[PDB]
Design a protein around this ligand. Structure first.
Ligand code: K
Ligand code: K
Ligand code: K
Ligand code: K
Ligand code: K
Ligand code: K
Ligand code: K
Ligand code: K
Ligand code: MG
Ligand code: MG
Length: 1169
RNA sequence: GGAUAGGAGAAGAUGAUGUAUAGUUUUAGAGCUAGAAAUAGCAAGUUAAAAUAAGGCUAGUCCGUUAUCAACUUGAAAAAGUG
DNA sequence: CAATACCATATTCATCATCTTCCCTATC
DNA sequence: TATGGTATTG
């Protein structure tokens, strides 16, 4: 009994088939377990496993980090409150308690309902004096009077809780006082560098034009329009664009050779500026220098829309400006609406459902929706004027808590907080003593290279502590080892040397690694001349000279330079033929030239004794990104260089890691020669062996040491490189193969032909390697692997062309059988191919081409050369194909109605429910967001996810008498309930109200559990209260091919014959419909939908056959396995008819399917109760 | 064929960490005038606190949405055995 | 109870690391 | 997306 296995691997399906030598699919009897009358069942050995897609880890990680951020924000507020504690207690012993319970209803409140002061009069007074928190912030920044401690806390808390971003490094110190003067000074520098061509900047209001609350490009265009003879692409135009934050290119301004794009935000502005000035001249520096000065005064103009001189709180003042303009424009708009149209005042200022002002404030209308709503009403009326300008500038009726506040840096909030602390520390001593602590609460971040501040219970953490104590914002630098933590941050993700697995790879920019690459390329270079008979290899001295004269004087080395600067200047050759390198050498010594420019000491870089130093330096520049840590680490070598050299080293960083370790490049040495790999690359006599040759040479001891230096299925698949969905498909494929092998009496197949859905692809090679290493586990006498099973991989186009050439067409919309059919055809074609041309094994088996598939055909074209009926192997003489019976066998297999389509049952995981926080409602569907927040008072969640249902057989109390009535029903265990239910199912069910639960009759039913009812009708579990369609529609292959040909009506005469087949078999349409109808009336039970379908088909029966076939393909949605879905027949829409009740499957037959569906356990549920 | 090291640009796949802004929910921000009331007229609106998976024990400024899952027997589990 | 329509958190920056493919050089 | 939860309307 010999057999082969065909596999079609997809992201949502694994199709499988078993074929024999005659390319037939066997049919067996399988035992049926359970309690029904059926003891066995006939099964064809072909099918497909269907499953929901595997998900990436992204959403989980995002929610994880959001959780962390909420926790740490709460801890910031707790730090600030603990600082204020005792003095607040002396002022108001329940202030923080009122803040904590602000969310509670007055019934549940333990203190007075007014948070700040505890009485209504003072609260109304506060809100009247300070209508927004920014009024209080500005007052506390600017006033010299002692303030109530509660307002001080509220201001500091608003700043710390919403502290702004950390994208800008250093300090800011805002100052918009002299934008005009800095612009005039930039014009002065320009006119001094170009005395013949000045710029007349008189009458140019640069202040209003560069802080015009418009795009950087718009303000640039406007400032250039005020300058005749000057264009935006000119030198001054590009300088202005640089001051505005754009990225101008100063190449054409200075007639440069290459680009010189400058941006003040990049970390490389100093380097780019110094390079441009080295190209053009340092006397232009005061130009860009001036451009930076002005830039500072503009660096924050979009956020601080107020003068910095009248207040030390520019941001709160800009918010107050927003508020005042909102108030004034609202009064104006109210008056204008009242006057113009008395109607629509209700719609605009009272209807929360509309995107008017009511929906903008009270409803769910965003600023953009409200703008779209009011723009036509504003244009219709008159007197609007500046309102439309504010609207198109997006500065009309603005709130203070908006989406664009993401622009606000944390330095601005820090400035206002520092000002408030400076003001109020004169009256409160604890504020003076804890000023820096509070500023630190605002400023402190956890470094990205530190990670969670865990203590041995986080699989995500790598941080190391210098001392065992709680980490606070104030002791972080003393308790946390920032250096070791950053090193762990990088190293825990970098690869070890695959040759020496206990060795880390070098930095990609290591000087040693670059020497290795340069010498590995140079050692295989050959040069020929006239007097030479054959190409000779470069000797050690020649390679050293080329490295010293070309690679250590030019970053890149060209073949022209190799021939003219060495072979002519040194060897006195006028013509030389080079081989091994095209145009230019790929390897180079970039790190060498970088360090040579930085330190300006060639003898330092050429001295081999300075090797281990430089390496570490490069390592430090690769290991670390934080410039402070780089400075601290490089301080050890500050005795070798100057202060300027050390600063240039600080500003130099690298990223990237090589693939080989230092102990492999320069470390291990051959036993008899004492030379390392780099030593052989520098000089190997006349052999000039490169890296692979050296580590593959049996006459050397490198291969021996590499050999001396040298998991579970789920682990191994999880560690592969690929999308998680395809990894799911791979694991399911392996499990299907294990089951199929077990079905064949533990006998292994001859061939496994795999095809991966969309072969040199690496993931298909991984599948093939896993299968090959699992099937072939024995060795022969020569200690070589015995390949009992040939693992062939085929690309989808082979079987696709096979189908389209022999008319075995697929229609994916008809059912899911096409996956199993693909697996079968893969098995057939792969086995036939390797039986016909065995020499192709090295190409297809793990471990002329345009006509490779022609042996299947009988007539082949312009050849028109015939072929025999019986195709055999040339040498073995074995029959591989009988065109008189094997095509009929394939056609018979593709027509079998019984195919094992199995939907993988899966417990649902993930979020508990929909995330929307719903308002309070009188419904038991609402879920409390906190233990004590009764959703009838506070709202909450609805729509939870059912992890799996449970069949319960028990009694429930009925009526006021609480009479016990026997029940049997499906209970949905939600994801949030799951741990509680599994910890104690009886107590969970009793708390749900169930009494006398038959614990042994409890059946766990995950999603997609299968039930059979009458007439073979099947249903799958979608939830505890909804079902999906469970039957496949096995349509005859004649209708399949007819639909294929009628749909894609649009080139041999066979196209004309296919059109003739379509026109002769138009009646098939009706038959198809009839088939569907029967299927429906047997398994779908969608009366109204089936009637709408019949009527729509009768209406468009006069349509072209092509469109009718396409719309019947659409109609197949009604019968498809799985969840119901709406579809469209011509212009008629058929909505999904759902199965909103799971009551019938309580008396049906539950079917537990194995992975292939061949092994079944059938439980008659009507017997329970 | 497969594999390895390197190079130019691109085009994708994946994993982790540290941040920010909103949104939503309840409460607070005295609504007024006629009306018994139903209701009508007007005034007003921009802000804040708190929660942001219920929660957990390991109690950390940590963890809580990925992967993995037919039934039966054995298993903590992974997984193995049953036709 | 069934037919039916509505609903579903979003956007944003910074630092890394790993893998793949395409085309070249040199190899096992 | 799409498909399972929910309220609405009979
Ligand atoms: K109370
Ligand atoms: K101009
Ligand atoms: K709104
Ligand atoms: K808000
Ligand atoms: K090259
Ligand atoms: K770095
Ligand atoms: K899952
Ligand atoms: K199953
Ligand atoms: Mg929490
Ligand atoms: Mg908010």
């Amino acid at each position: 009994k010999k057999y082969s296995i065909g596999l079609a691997i997809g992201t949502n399906s694994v199709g499988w088939a078993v074929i024999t030598d005659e390319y037939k699919v066997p049919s067996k009897k399988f035992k049926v377990l359970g309690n029904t009358d059926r003891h066995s069942i006939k099964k064809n050995l072909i099918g497909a496993l269907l499953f929901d897609s595997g998900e990436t880890a992204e959403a989980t990680r995002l929610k994880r980090t959001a959780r962390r951020r909420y926790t740490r924000r709460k801890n910031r507020i707790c730090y600030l409150q603990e600082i204020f504690s005792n003095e607040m207690a002396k002022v108001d012993d329940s202030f923080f308690h009122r803040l904590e319970e602000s969310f509670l209803v007055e019934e549940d409140k333990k203190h007075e309902r007014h948070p700040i002061f505890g009485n209504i009069v003072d609260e109304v007074a506060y809100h009247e004096k300070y209508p927004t928190i920014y009024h209080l912030r500005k007052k506390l920044v600017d006033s010299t009077d002692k303030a109530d401690l509660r307002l001080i806390y509220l201001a500091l808390a608003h700043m710390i809780k919403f502290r702004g971003h950390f994208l800008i490094e250093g300090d800011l110190n805002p100052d918009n006082s002299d934008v005009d003067k800095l612009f005039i000074q930039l014009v002065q520098t320009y006119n001094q560098l170009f005395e013949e061509n000045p710029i007349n900047a008189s009458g140019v209001d640069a202040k209003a034009i560069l802080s015009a609350r418009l795009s950087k490009s718009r303000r640039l265009e406007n400032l250039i329009a005020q300058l005749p003879g000057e264009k935006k692409n000119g030198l001054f135009g590009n300088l202005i664009a640089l001051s505005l934050g754009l990225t101008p290119n100063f190449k054409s301004n200075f007639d440069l050779a290459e680009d010189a794009k400058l941006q003040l935000s990049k970390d490389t502005y100093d380097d780019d500026l110094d390079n441009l000035l080295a190209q053009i001249g340092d006397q232009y520096a005061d130009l860009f220098l001036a451009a930076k000065n002005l830039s500072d005064a503009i660096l924050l103009s979009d956020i601080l829309r107020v003068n910095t001189e009248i207040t030390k709180a520019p941001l709160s003042a800009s918010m107050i400006k927003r508020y005042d303009e909102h108030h004034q424009d609202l009064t104006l708009l109210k008056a204008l609406v009242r006057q113009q149209l008395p109607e629509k005042y209700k719609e605009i200022f009272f209807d929360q459902s509309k995107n008017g002002y009511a929906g903008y404030i009270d409803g769910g209308a965003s600023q953009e929706e409200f703008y779209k709503f009011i723009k036509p009403i504003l244009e219709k009326m008159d007197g609007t004027e500046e309102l439309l300008v504010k609207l198109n500038r997006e500065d009309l009726l603005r709130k203070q808590r908006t989406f664009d506040n993401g622009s606000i840096p944390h330095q601005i909030h820090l400035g206002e907080l520092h000002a408030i602390l400076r003001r109020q520390e004169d009256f409160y001593p604890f504020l003076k003593d804890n000023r820096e602590k509070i500023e630190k609460i605002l400023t402190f971040r956890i470094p990205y290279y530190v990670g969670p501040l865990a203590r041995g219970n986080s699989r995500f953490a790598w941080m190391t502590r210098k001392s065992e104590e709680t980490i606070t914002p104030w002791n972080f630098e003393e308790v946390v080892d920032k250096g070791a933590s950053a090193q762990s941050f990088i190293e825990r993700m970098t690869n070890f040397d695959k040759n020496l697995p206990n060795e880390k790879v070098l930095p990609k920019h290591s000087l040693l690694y670059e020497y290795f690459t340069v010498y590995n390329e140079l050692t295989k270079v050959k040069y020929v001349t006239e007097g030479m008979r054959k190409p000779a290899f470069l000797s050690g001295e020649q390679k050293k000279a080329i490295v010293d004269l070309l690679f250590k004087t030019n970053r890149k080395v060209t073949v022209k330079q190799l021939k003219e600067d060495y072979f002519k200047k040194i060897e006195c050759f006028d013509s030389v033929e080079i081989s091994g390198v095209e145009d230019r050498f790929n390897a180079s010594l970039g790190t060498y030239h970088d360090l040579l420019k930085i330190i300006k000491d060639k003898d330092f870089l050429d001295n081999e004794e300075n090797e281990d130093i430089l390496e570490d330096i490069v390592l430090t520049l690769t290991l670390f990104e934080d410039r402070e840590m780089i400075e601290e680490r490089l301080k050890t070598y500050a005795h070798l260089f100057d202060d300027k050299v050390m600063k240039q080293l600080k500003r130099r960083r690298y990223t990237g890691w090589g693939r080989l370790s230092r102990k492999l490049i320069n470390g291990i040495r051959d036993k008899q020669s004492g030379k390392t790999i780099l030593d052989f690359l520098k000089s190997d006599g006349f052999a000039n062996r490169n890296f692979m040759q050296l580590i593959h040479d049996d006459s050397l001891t490198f291969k021996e040491d590499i050999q001396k230096a040298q998991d579970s299925l789920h682990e191994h698949i999880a560690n592969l490189a690929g999308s998680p969905a395809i990894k799911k498909g791979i694991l399911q494929t392996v499990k299907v193969v294990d089951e199929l092998v077990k079905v064949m009496g533990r006998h292994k197949p001859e061939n496994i032909v795999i095809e991966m859905a969309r072969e040199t692809r690496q993931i298909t090679k991984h599948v093939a390697q896993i299968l090959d290493s699992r099937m072939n586990t024995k060795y022969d006498e020569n200690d070589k692997l015995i390949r009992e099973v040939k693992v062939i991989t085929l690309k989808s186009k082979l079987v696709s062309d096979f189908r389209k050439d022999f008319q075995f067409y697929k229609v994916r919309e008809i059912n899911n059988y096409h996956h199993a059919h693909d697996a079968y055809l893969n098995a057939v074609v792969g086995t036939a191919l390797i039986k016909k041309y065995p020499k192709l094994e090295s190409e297809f088996v793990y471990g002329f081409y345009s006509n490779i598939m022609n042996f299947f055909k009988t007539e082949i074209t312009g050849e028109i050369r015939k072929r025999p009926l019986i195709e055999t192997n040339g040498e073995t003489g074995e029959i591989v194909w009988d065109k008189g019976r094997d095509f009929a066998t394939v056609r018979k297999v593709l027509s079998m109605p019984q195919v094992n389509i199995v939907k993988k049952t899966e417990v649902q995981t993930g979020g508990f429910s929909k995330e929307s926080i719903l308002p309070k409602r009188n419904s038991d569907k609402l879920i409390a967001r906190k233990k004590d927040w009764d959703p009838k008072k506070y709202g909450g969640f609805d729509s939870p996810t059912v992890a799996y249902s449970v069949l319960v057989v028990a009694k429930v109390e009925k009526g006021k008498s609480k009479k016990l009535k026997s029940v049997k029903e499906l209970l949905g265990i939600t994801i949030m309930e799951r741990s509680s239910f599994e910890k104690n199912p009886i107590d969970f069910l009793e708390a749900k109200g169930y009494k006398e639960v038959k614990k042994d009759l409890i059946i766990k039913l995950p999603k997609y559990s299968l039930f059979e009812l009458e007439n073979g009708r099947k249903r799958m579990l979608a939830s505890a209260g909804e079902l999906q369609k469970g039957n496949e529609l096995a349509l005859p292959s004649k209708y399949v091919n007819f639909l294929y040909l009628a749909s894609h009506y649009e080139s041999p005469e066979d196209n004309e014959q296919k059109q003739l087949f379509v026109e002769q078999h138009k009646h098939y349409l009706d038959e198809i419909i009839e088939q569907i109808s029967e299927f429906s009336k047997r398994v779908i039970l969608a009366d109204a939908n089936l009637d709408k379908v019949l009527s729509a088909y009768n209406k468009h029966r006069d349509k072209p056959i092509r469109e009718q076939a396409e719309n019947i393909i659409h109609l197949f949605t009604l019968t498809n396995l799985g969840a119901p879905a709406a579809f469209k027949y011509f212009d008629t829409t058929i909505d999904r008819k759902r199965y909103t009740s799971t009551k019938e499957v309580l008396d049906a037959t539950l079917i537990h399917q194995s992975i292939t569906g061949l092994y079944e356990t059938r439980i008659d549920l009507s017997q329970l109760g």
